Short mmCIF file of N, CA, C and O in Angstrom, two decimals:
data_model
loop_
_atom_site.label_atom_id
_atom_site.label_comp_id
_atom_site.label_asym_id
_atom_site.label_seq_id
_atom_site.Cartn_x
_atom_site.Cartn_y
_atom_site.Cartn_z
N UNK A 1 -12.86 10.52 -3.42
CA UNK A 1 -14.32 11.50 -3.43
C UNK A 1 -13.64 12.00 -1.61
O UNK A 1 -13.22 13.46 -1.51
N UNK A 2 -14.02 11.33 -0.19
CA UNK A 2 -14.24 11.56 0.63
C UNK A 2 -12.61 11.88 0.86
O UNK A 2 -11.51 11.41 0.22
N UNK A 3 -11.87 13.33 1.60
CA UNK A 3 -10.58 13.36 1.72
C UNK A 3 -9.88 12.17 2.93
O UNK A 3 -10.30 11.73 3.40
N UNK A 4 -8.84 12.19 2.09
CA UNK A 4 -7.38 10.97 3.06
C UNK A 4 -6.77 10.20 2.46
O UNK A 4 -7.15 10.09 1.01
N UNK A 5 -6.16 9.44 3.04
CA UNK A 5 -5.87 8.17 1.93
C UNK A 5 -5.83 6.70 2.41
O UNK A 5 -6.69 6.40 3.47
N UNK A 6 -6.11 6.05 1.03
CA UNK A 6 -7.00 5.10 0.72
C UNK A 6 -6.21 4.38 0.25
O UNK A 6 -5.90 4.14 -1.10
N UNK A 7 -5.14 3.41 0.85
CA UNK A 7 -4.48 2.09 -0.02
C UNK A 7 -5.54 0.59 0.07
O UNK A 7 -5.69 0.16 1.04
N UNK A 8 -5.95 0.85 -1.51
CA UNK A 8 -6.59 -0.54 -1.86
C UNK A 8 -5.70 -1.85 -2.06
O UNK A 8 -4.86 -1.78 -2.01
N UNK A 9 -6.57 -2.84 -1.78
CA UNK A 9 -5.68 -4.03 -1.85
C UNK A 9 -6.68 -5.36 -3.04
O UNK A 9 -7.92 -4.50 -2.95
N UNK A 10 -6.06 -5.56 -3.45
CA UNK A 10 -7.30 -6.43 -4.48
C UNK A 10 -7.76 -8.35 -3.83
O UNK A 10 -8.70 -8.36 -4.44
N UNK A 11 -7.46 -8.15 -2.50
CA UNK A 11 -8.18 -9.21 -1.94
C UNK A 11 -9.80 -8.36 -1.37
O UNK A 11 -9.00 -7.81 -0.22
N UNK A 12 -10.70 -8.43 -1.78
CA UNK A 12 -11.87 -7.88 -0.85
C UNK A 12 -11.88 -8.46 0.12
O UNK A 12 -12.84 -7.69 1.59
N UNK A 13 -11.42 -9.48 0.93
CA UNK A 13 -11.60 -9.91 1.83
C UNK A 13 -10.80 -8.93 3.38
O UNK A 13 -10.90 -9.13 4.17
N UNK A 14 -9.86 -8.32 2.18
CA UNK A 14 -9.31 -7.67 3.67
C UNK A 14 -9.47 -6.02 3.68
O UNK A 14 -10.15 -5.33 2.35
N UNK A 15 -9.11 -5.61 5.02
CA UNK A 15 -10.50 -3.63 4.59
C UNK A 15 -9.28 -2.92 4.14
O UNK A 15 -8.08 -3.09 4.38
N UNK A 16 -9.58 -2.09 3.55
CA UNK A 16 -8.55 -0.88 3.19
C UNK A 16 -8.16 -0.30 3.90
O UNK A 16 -8.49 0.14 5.27
N UNK A 17 -6.71 -0.46 3.67
CA UNK A 17 -5.98 0.50 4.72
C UNK A 17 -5.83 2.15 5.02
O UNK A 17 -6.50 2.55 4.07
N UNK A 18 -6.75 2.97 6.01
CA UNK A 18 -6.92 3.85 5.92
C UNK A 18 -5.99 5.41 7.11
O UNK A 18 -4.98 4.23 7.77
N UNK A 19 -5.83 6.56 6.70
CA UNK A 19 -5.23 6.88 7.17
C UNK A 19 -5.59 8.25 7.53
O UNK A 19 -6.06 8.82 5.81
N UNK A 20 -5.09 9.16 8.44
CA UNK A 20 -6.30 10.88 8.55
C UNK A 20 -4.75 11.80 8.58
O UNK A 20 -5.00 12.95 7.92
N UNK A 21 -3.48 11.54 9.35
CA UNK A 21 -2.93 12.68 9.18
C UNK A 21 -1.19 12.07 9.58
O UNK A 21 -1.48 11.36 10.25
N UNK A 22 -0.44 12.81 9.16
CA UNK A 22 0.79 12.54 9.44
C UNK A 22 2.09 12.47 8.09
O UNK A 22 1.63 12.81 7.19
N UNK A 23 2.91 12.04 8.48
CA UNK A 23 4.05 12.14 7.56
C UNK A 23 4.88 10.38 7.53
O UNK A 23 5.40 10.05 8.21
N UNK A 24 4.44 10.34 6.36
CA UNK A 24 4.92 8.69 5.93
C UNK A 24 6.24 8.66 4.59
O UNK A 24 5.67 9.64 3.61
N UNK A 25 6.71 7.60 4.99
CA UNK A 25 7.49 6.89 3.49
C UNK A 25 6.65 5.56 2.75
O UNK A 25 6.20 5.14 3.37
N UNK A 26 7.04 5.94 1.37
CA UNK A 26 6.61 5.00 0.71
C UNK A 26 7.09 3.07 1.82
O UNK A 26 6.40 2.10 1.36
N UNK A 27 8.03 2.73 1.70
CA UNK A 27 7.91 1.66 2.52
C UNK A 27 8.05 1.49 3.86
O UNK A 27 7.63 0.59 3.98
N UNK A 28 7.57 2.59 4.80
CA UNK A 28 6.61 2.43 5.64
C UNK A 28 5.20 1.78 5.02
O UNK A 28 4.47 0.61 5.98
N UNK A 29 4.85 2.12 4.53
CA UNK A 29 3.44 2.03 4.23
C UNK A 29 3.45 0.49 3.44
O UNK A 29 2.12 -0.25 3.77
N UNK A 30 4.59 -0.06 2.60
CA UNK A 30 4.46 -1.11 2.27
C UNK A 30 4.79 -2.33 3.29
O UNK A 30 3.92 -3.21 3.05
N UNK A 31 5.43 -1.76 4.30
CA UNK A 31 5.69 -2.51 5.18
C UNK A 31 4.17 -2.99 5.93
O UNK A 31 3.59 -3.93 6.07
N UNK A 32 3.35 -1.55 6.25
CA UNK A 32 2.34 -1.87 7.18
C UNK A 32 0.85 -2.55 6.16
O UNK A 32 0.75 -3.62 6.74
N UNK A 33 1.40 -2.45 4.44
CA UNK A 33 0.43 -3.58 3.93
C UNK A 33 0.73 -4.73 4.23
O UNK A 33 0.27 -5.90 4.19
N UNK A 34 2.07 -4.88 3.60
CA UNK A 34 2.70 -6.56 3.88
C UNK A 34 2.92 -7.43 5.29
O UNK A 34 1.85 -8.23 5.29
N UNK A 35 2.27 -6.45 6.20
CA UNK A 35 1.74 -6.88 7.40
C UNK A 35 0.40 -7.21 7.15
O UNK A 35 0.03 -7.97 8.19
N UNK A 36 -0.58 -6.50 7.17
CA UNK A 36 -2.11 -6.84 6.36
C UNK A 36 -2.41 -8.23 5.63
O UNK A 36 -3.01 -8.96 5.98
N UNK A 37 -1.43 -8.09 4.73
CA UNK A 37 -1.28 -9.23 3.87
C UNK A 37 -0.48 -10.71 4.25
O UNK A 37 -0.99 -11.86 3.56
N UNK A 38 -0.17 -10.68 5.15
CA UNK A 38 1.30 -11.89 5.85
C UNK A 38 1.63 -12.37 4.84
O UNK A 38 1.98 -13.56 4.60
N UNK A 39 2.84 -11.17 3.95
CA UNK A 39 3.70 -11.73 3.18
C UNK A 39 5.22 -11.74 4.03
O UNK A 39 5.13 -11.24 4.83
N UNK A 40 5.33 -13.03 3.69
CA UNK A 40 7.05 -13.23 4.33
C UNK A 40 7.90 -12.32 3.63
O UNK A 40 8.10 -11.76 3.07
N UNK A 41 8.15 -12.15 4.73
CA UNK A 41 9.72 -11.06 4.74
C UNK A 41 10.54 -11.20 3.40
O UNK A 41 11.15 -10.00 2.82
N UNK A 42 10.65 -12.32 3.05
CA UNK A 42 11.72 -12.77 2.02
C UNK A 42 11.21 -12.47 0.36
O UNK A 42 11.68 -12.41 -0.53
N UNK A 43 9.44 -12.28 0.54
CA UNK A 43 8.57 -11.84 -0.41
C UNK A 43 8.88 -10.36 -0.65
O UNK A 43 7.87 -10.16 -1.44
N UNK A 44 9.05 -9.70 0.15
CA UNK A 44 8.39 -8.16 0.06
C UNK A 44 9.01 -7.49 -0.72
O UNK A 44 8.21 -6.41 -0.94
N UNK A 45 10.22 -7.71 -0.99
CA UNK A 45 11.00 -7.01 -1.69
C UNK A 45 10.31 -6.68 -3.86
O UNK A 45 10.82 -6.01 -4.29
N UNK A 46 9.60 -7.70 -3.81
CA UNK A 46 8.85 -7.85 -4.84
C UNK A 46 7.86 -6.85 -5.25
O UNK A 46 7.33 -6.56 -6.10
N UNK A 47 7.52 -5.71 -4.33
CA UNK A 47 5.84 -5.71 -3.98
C UNK A 47 6.14 -3.83 -3.78
O UNK A 47 7.39 -3.23 -3.31
N UNK A 48 5.61 -3.68 -4.73
CA UNK A 48 5.69 -1.66 -4.31
C UNK A 48 3.99 -0.97 -4.66
O UNK A 48 3.07 -1.69 -5.14
N UNK A 49 4.14 0.97 -4.76
CA UNK A 49 2.84 1.25 -5.06
C UNK A 49 2.72 1.29 -6.13
O UNK A 49 4.15 1.59 -7.14
N UNK A 50 1.55 2.21 -6.65
CA UNK A 50 1.19 2.74 -8.04
C UNK A 50 0.32 3.36 -7.75
O UNK A 50 -0.94 2.78 -7.29
N UNK A 51 0.38 4.42 -8.91
CA UNK A 51 -0.99 5.09 -9.12
C UNK A 51 -1.82 4.90 -10.39
O UNK A 51 -0.65 5.18 -11.48
N UNK A 52 -2.96 4.94 -10.06
CA UNK A 52 -4.12 4.37 -11.49
C UNK A 52 -3.92 6.02 -12.47
O UNK A 52 -3.81 6.00 -13.51
N UNK A 53 -4.33 6.84 -11.83
CA UNK A 53 -4.61 7.59 -12.27
C UNK A 53 -3.41 9.04 -12.88
O UNK A 53 -3.75 9.51 -14.04
N UNK A 54 -2.58 8.24 -12.33
CA UNK A 54 -1.47 9.30 -12.45
C UNK A 54 -0.31 8.21 -13.71
O UNK A 54 0.72 8.44 -14.24
N UNK A 55 -0.30 6.79 -13.56
CA UNK A 55 0.78 6.03 -13.95
C UNK A 55 2.02 6.12 -13.91
O UNK A 55 2.82 5.70 -14.38
N UNK A 56 2.01 6.41 -12.84
CA UNK A 56 3.51 6.53 -12.20
C UNK A 56 3.69 6.22 -10.81
O UNK A 56 2.70 5.65 -10.08
N UNK A 57 4.43 5.06 -10.15
CA UNK A 57 5.43 4.28 -9.64
C UNK A 57 5.92 5.04 -8.44
O UNK A 57 7.01 5.95 -9.52
N UNK A 58 5.78 5.38 -7.58
CA UNK A 58 6.89 5.59 -6.31
C UNK A 58 7.78 4.99 -6.21
O UNK A 58 7.96 4.06 -5.86
N UNK A 59 9.00 5.95 -5.81
CA UNK A 59 10.21 5.47 -5.97
C UNK A 59 10.27 5.06 -3.73
O UNK A 59 9.31 5.44 -3.25
N UNK A 60 11.09 3.94 -3.59
CA UNK A 60 11.22 4.28 -2.44
C UNK A 60 10.93 4.56 -1.05
O UNK A 60 10.54 4.54 0.19
#
């Protein structure tokens, strides 16, 4: 609805990430999310981004 970027998490205990302006790559956002979800660096390799409305996974 409202303009902007909203990266959601399946854990309701964590606030969804918000962005307003800038240029970013997928890996940077993945790292930022992993910091919020307290994922160890050894296991962040298994995670990525996905879009429900388009059924497409972003490249790294």
